Amino acid sequence: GQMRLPSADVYRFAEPDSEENIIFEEGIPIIKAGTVIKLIERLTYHMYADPNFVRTFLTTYRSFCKPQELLSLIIERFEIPEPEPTEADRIAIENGDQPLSAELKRFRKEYIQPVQLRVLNVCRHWVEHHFYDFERDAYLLQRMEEFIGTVRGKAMKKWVESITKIIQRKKIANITFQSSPPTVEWHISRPGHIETFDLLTLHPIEIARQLTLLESDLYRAVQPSELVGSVWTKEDKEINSPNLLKMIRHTTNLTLWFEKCIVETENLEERVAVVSRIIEILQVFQELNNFNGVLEVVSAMNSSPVYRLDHTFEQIPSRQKKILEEAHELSEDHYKKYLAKLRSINPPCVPFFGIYLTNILKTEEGNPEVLKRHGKELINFSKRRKVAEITGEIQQYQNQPYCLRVESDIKRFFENLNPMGNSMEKEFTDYLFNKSLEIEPRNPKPLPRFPKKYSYPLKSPGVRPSNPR
């Protein structure tokens, strides 16, 4: 027989399942909707563990439950009453004998200990992976420390002492590789001569590598707290989504820098060399699976100032036109080919974040917070699961590091890139378009000639790596 449960009058998590409090999707069940009590019961269920559910819940719960209330509810879940002695136990005690306590022992082993351990696993995941709740509410942290630090009894003792230490470490808070990273490559600019660094004087291989390390670090720094609730679109976005915004602003700046390098090169032959070099950088981005970098280049080539430069495009070699066309096609048909390629490559990679943002936003805007059933409002949990499937995909690509060596000077050069200067966006993008009109006027105006601006060789060293002993 199934174990008997505490009375639902003294322990709220023993109410029977019904369509008035939980709805399952059509081999563990998948929850479509439920009351917060039923969600917490299934989060800490005695029959099975559900690590996906724990991540989904802890990532998304603040849209339906405050952090203080979540802690109260899991403490309530933890405090499970033990059953009274049975008739057989009673008769043994009346004869001065020790009772067998078979039902009590089974209920401890198969209900209390799994539920309590799974509550502690929620606490552990909460502290390790969602610690911002405690950084932003010091009183919440005090309550968690107090709860964990007063759990008695030896069955939980190893995990109680461990979680206490994890909390203390989180309050005051190294990579190994299969191989050595390749040698840093240099072209016209030599090591230490940061004043000469530029698009054509750094080695195109090393430009792509150092931008990939920078863009990988920016990608890896974005936490789910910056995404859930669509907070990067709201008035407090600078407060709630700073790592995401830093990542996007880097991408915008690099795209504008590519555009500025192109249209400020007024001599046609020199501008062809600039565009060819950027396509070579794109080729190395592709080899590195840096899709953010790929699209930084594609966006620049499709911008209004650059796209119209027919005289420049006409002189790009056919093999480079083919590289650029293939990269452009990743974005066509709502990123159909990009999505397939991302799902096929061997990481490390740098995804393009924009698709994730649109899908999180539309998932949150296009599904209701609650479902109404039999006069009750149930939390629409399927909507939160869809959001957490996206944040989980994001996190999966955040794990793998690049086996590339940092060059601190090249890193700083790209960190400090500021193509707009002090200009506002509209003034700057109008400037770029007017430069485009200057260097290749609208027909039927004649094409002017312009003097060279670069005193060094324009020949590319290419993008195949070298290896001395």
Partner 1 sequence: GMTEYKLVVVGAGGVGKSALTIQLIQNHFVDEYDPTIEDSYRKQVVIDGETCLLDILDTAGQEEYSAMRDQYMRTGEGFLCVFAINNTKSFEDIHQYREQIKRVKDSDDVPMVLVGNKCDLAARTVESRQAQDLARSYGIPYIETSAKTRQGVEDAFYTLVREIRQH
Angle, vertex CA 197, rays to CA 194 and CA 203, nearest 5: 120
**The one segment of 75-83, 96-104, 386-394, 447-455 that binds partner 1 by CB under 8 A:** 386-394
Residue closer to ligand FFV by CB (options 302, 398) is 302
49 binds partner 1 (CB under 8 A): yes
68 binding partner (options ligand FFV, partner 1, none; Cβ < 5 to 8 Å by kind): none
103 binding partner (options ligand FFV, partner 1, none; Cβ < 5 to 8 Å by kind): none
Residue closer to partner 1 by CB (options 176, 467) is 176
Query: Cα separation of 291 and 354, whole Å?
Result: 11
Site map for partner 1, 410-439, x if CB under 8 A? ---------------xx------x------
Q: How far is the CB of 95 from partner 1 (least distance, A)?
A: 31
210 binding partner (options ligand FFV, partner 1, none; Cβ < 5 to 8 Å by kind): none
149 binding partner (options partner 1, ligand FFV, none; Cβ < 5 to 8 Å by kind): none
Among 5, 20, 52, 406, binds partner 1 (CB under 8 A): 52
Phi, psi of 123 (to 5 degrees): -60, -45
Q: How far is the CB of 18 from partner 1 (least distance, A)?
A: 23
444 binding partner (options partner 1, ligand FFV, none; Cβ < 5 to 8 Å by kind): none
Residue 31 contacts residue 23 (beta carbons within 8 Å): yes
Q: How far is the CB of 163 from partner 1 (least distance, A)?
A: 8
**The one segment of 56-64, 72-80, 156-164, 407-415 that binds partner 1 by CB under 8 A:** 156-164
Site map for partner 1, 239-278, x if CB under 8 A? ------x--xx-xx--xx--x-------------------
Q: Which residues bind ligand FFV (CB under 6 A)?
A: 275, 298, 301-302, 306-307, 309, 312-313, 324-325, 328
Query: Cα separation of 292 and 350, whole Å?
Result: 6
Among 85, 182, 242, 392, binds partner 1 (CB under 8 A): 392
Total residues in contact with partner 1, by rule CB under 8 A: 82
Q: How far is the CB of 251 from ligand FFV (least distance, A)?
A: 17
68 binds partner 1 (CB under 8 A): no
Among 152, 190, 319, 343, binds partner 1 (CB under 8 A): 343
322 binds partner 1 (CB under 8 A): no
44 binds partner 1 (CB under 8 A): no
The size of the chain, in residues, is 469
Residue closer to ligand FFV by CB (options 258, 353) is 258
234 binds partner 1 (CB under 8 A): yes
Among 175, 375, 446, 449, binds partner 1 (CB under 8 A): 175
Residue 293 contacts residue 208 (beta carbons within 8 Å): yes
Among 19, 30, 48, 269, binds partner 1 (CB under 8 A): 48
178 binds partner 1 (CB under 8 A): yes
Query: Cα separation of 459 and 446, whole Å?
Result: 28
Q: How far is the CB of 199 from ligand FFV (least distance, A)?
A: 13
Residue closer to partner 1 by CB (options 36, 166) is 166
347 binds partner 1 (CB under 8 A): yes
166 binding partner (options ligand FFV, partner 1, none; Cβ < 5 to 8 Å by kind): partner 1
Query: Cα separation of 75 and 12, whole Å?
Result: 12
